[PDB]
């Protein structure tokens, strides 16, 4: 990869987020992107504030330029897709900070722990390309190929892991740099079991095997460590309902178009288009939401609060009024 510029880290470094509180749970990323005539850069100032606010990077011998240098190498591999692009990664980081600050869940893992999450949330979709893991498989795509060949249906996620390794391969862009011996190990195997527990099709033994450890006053300790980091990306990573309902609606309808855009092309090649990546289907947007909220995102943001994460209680609250917001839409349509 080409080493990051001075003129790019200054691009970032100008941008200032007046009026912006990027620790808060309210926090609206659609409005900072709309600030600006630049949203890459003030998406790039936002993680940056992030990680240097935490305090975390300057306790593991990051440098502020190394971070931004890492930032920017993150950046420059998503692509313009209408959901997996940058602004995604970047609205996950923001939303684990808020889940370990101000859900307290920081109280349940190491300040190094704390620094991967952070991290991997900026690397955890990198070169996505707007199709699914079933995209690849379905069209026998090379991708899809060497996943079947290598025994690892997680074509997306290995992939996401494959440019993660690359970046941190550079000391000038290496966040773990400051690290040796097993805080490197540590780090690096947690950020990659991190990033392979985002494939949904390990959804529930992820959440099962995390309920079970909480409930288990022997858990073994380093056991639970990964798996509360695990479940904490996963729930960034299905946090849109989560938001206030404008910042959840504006999510879901990138979400839909990007789906639709893969239900085009499943089309052009005559694979099988599941309902939900169908545009013909027409299906309503708070219909969507509601089957999501009641089928994924309600059961397990209420069951890890319930479980162990009490300090996330406003996700369950916000996601039950999010749910009666899409319901008041029926009703008056
Ligand atoms: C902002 O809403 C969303 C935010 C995220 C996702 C994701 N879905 N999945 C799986 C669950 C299909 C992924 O694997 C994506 C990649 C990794 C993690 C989560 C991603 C879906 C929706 C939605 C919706 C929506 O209205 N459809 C209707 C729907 C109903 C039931 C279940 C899923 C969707
Ligand atoms: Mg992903
Ligand atoms: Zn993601």
């Avoid at 993680?47 to 890492?70: H, I």
């Avoid at 190498?73 to 900070?97: A, G, L």
């Avoid at 869940?105 to 079933?134: P, R």
């Avoid at 855009?261 to 089309?267: A, F, P, T, V």
């Amino acid at each position: 990869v080409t080493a990051i510029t001075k003129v790019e880290r200054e691009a970032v470094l100008v941008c200032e987020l007046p009026s912006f509180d990027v620790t808060d749970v309210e926090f609206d990323l659609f409005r900072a992107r709309e600030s600006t005539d630049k949203p890459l850069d003030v998406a790039a100032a936002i993680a940056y504030r992030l990680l240097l606010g935490s305090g975390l990077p300057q306790k593991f011998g990051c440098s502020d330029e190394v971070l931004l240098n890492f930032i920017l190498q993150c950046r420059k591999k998503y692509r313009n897709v209408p959901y997996h692009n940058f602004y995604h990664v970047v609205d996950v980081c923001q939303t684990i900070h808020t889940f370990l600050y101000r859900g307290n869940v920081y109280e349940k893992l190491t300040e190094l722990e704390c620094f991967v999450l952070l991290i991997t949330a900026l690397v955890h979709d990198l070169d996505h390309m707007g199709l699914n893991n079933s995209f690849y498989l379905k069209t026998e795509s090379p991708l899809g190929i060497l996943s079947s060949a290598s025994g690892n249906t997680s074509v997306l996620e290995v992939h996401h892991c494959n440019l993660a390794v690359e970046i941190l391969s550079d000391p000038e862009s290496d966040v773990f740099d400051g690290l040796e011996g097993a805080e490197r190990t540590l780090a690096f195997r947690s950020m990659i079991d991190c990033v392979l527990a985002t494939d949904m099709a390990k959804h529930g033994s992820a959440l099962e095997a995390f309920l079970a450890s909480a409930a288990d006053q022997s858990s073994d300790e380093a056991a639970f460590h990964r798996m509360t980091m695990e479940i904490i990306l996963k729930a960034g990573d299905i946090s849109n309902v989560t938001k206030p309902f404008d910042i959840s609606r504006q999510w879901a309808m990138a979400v839909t178009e990007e789906f639709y855009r893969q239900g085009d092309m499943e089309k052009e090649r005559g694979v099988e288009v599941l309902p939900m990546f169908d545009r013909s289907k027409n299906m309503e947007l708070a219909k969507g939401q509601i089957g999501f909220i009641d089928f994924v995102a309600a059961p397990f943001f209420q069951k890890i609060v319930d479980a162990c994460l009490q300090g996330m209680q406003w996700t369950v609250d916000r996601i039950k009024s999010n749910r009666a917001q899409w319901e008041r839409v029926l009703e008056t349509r």
